[PDB]
Paper text:
The peptidylprolyl cis-trans-isomerase [name] ([name], PPIF), which is genomically expressed and imported into mitochondria, is consistently implicated as a key player in the sequence of events leading to PT pore opening and eventual cell death by necrosis. [name] binds to the lateral stalk of the F1F0-ATPase and positively regulates pore opening. There is mounting evidence that [name] is key in mediating Ca2+-induced pore opening, and its absence (e.g. in PPIF knock-out animals) desensitizes the pore to Ca2+, in an inorganic phosphate (Pi)-dependent manner. The [name] binding cleft in cyclophilins is highly conserved, and [name] targeting provides a convenient way to obtain selectivity for the [name] [name].
To determine the precise binding mode of [name] to [name], we determined the x-ray structure of the complex to 1.1 Å resolution. We utilized the protein sequence of [name] (PPIF) with a K133I mutation, which enhances crystallization without significantly affecting activity. The core of the macrocycle is almost identical to that of [name] itself, whereas the pendant quinolinium group can adopt two poses. In both poses, the position of the quinolinium group is partially stabilized by crystal contacts with a symmetry-related molecule. In one of the poses, the 1-(pent-4-enyl)quinolinium (salmon color) extends back over the macrocycle and makes an intramolecular hydrophobic contact with [MeLeu]4 of [name]. In the other pose (magenta) the 1-(pent-4-enyl)quinolinium moiety extends in the opposite direction to lie along the surface of the [name], making hydrophobic contacts with Ala-103, Gly-104, and Pro-105. [name] showed similar binding to SmBzCsA at Ki of [name] = 202 nm and Ki of CypA = 236 nm. [name] has less intrinsic [name] binding than [name] but is a more potent PT pore inhibitor. The greater effect of [name] in [name] Ca2+ buffering compared with [name] indicates that quinolinium is effective in directing the drug to mitochondria in accordance with its more negative electropotential and in agreement with the Nernst equation. Neither [name] nor [name] had any effect on CRC from [name] KO mice, whereas CRC in the mitochondria from WT mice was significantly increased by both compounds, proving that [name] inhibits PT pore opening via binding to [name].
Numbering used by the authors:
A (entry chain C): 1 to 11
B (entry chain A): 1 to 165
The structure:
Amino acid sequence: XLLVXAGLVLA
Amino acid sequence: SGNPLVYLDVDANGKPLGRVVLELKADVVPKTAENFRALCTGEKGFGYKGSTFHRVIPSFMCQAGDFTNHNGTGGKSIYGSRFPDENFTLKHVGPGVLSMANAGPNTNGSQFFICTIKTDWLDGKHVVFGHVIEGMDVVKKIESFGSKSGRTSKKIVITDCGQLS
């Protein structure tokens, strides 16, 4: 999807 | 008191994309603003200079600030490995919003993103702390080298950065 993460990059 | 302005001078292959100028809302989130400010000046001996926009998703955002692992997995703050979410007062109201990337609650480090759309599903999860005031066209140039996966086509480097005011 549209998230902004640092390590577990998600959909 | 005051809301700092900072700049990011962005290049690729030693060829300039331009300057992005950001206001930091220290009036609302001074701790978060201070971290970013100091990472721009480099006053603690580490910071954004030389690091990349590593994850760039057209129609969404440009993400940067991993100056430890250089891929999204790292970064650190001027307060330690991580710091808590200061507040969620500011919202992801539209293009140009500057907000912290994280790995869930209370995991702010150095990574950040610049929105190219409104991203209000991040409200209450990502601390908003400023916005672009000049150089949205630069941001659009960055975006042109991204992809749905977020992989960029070339190394988009923050060659210099600092505080304007």
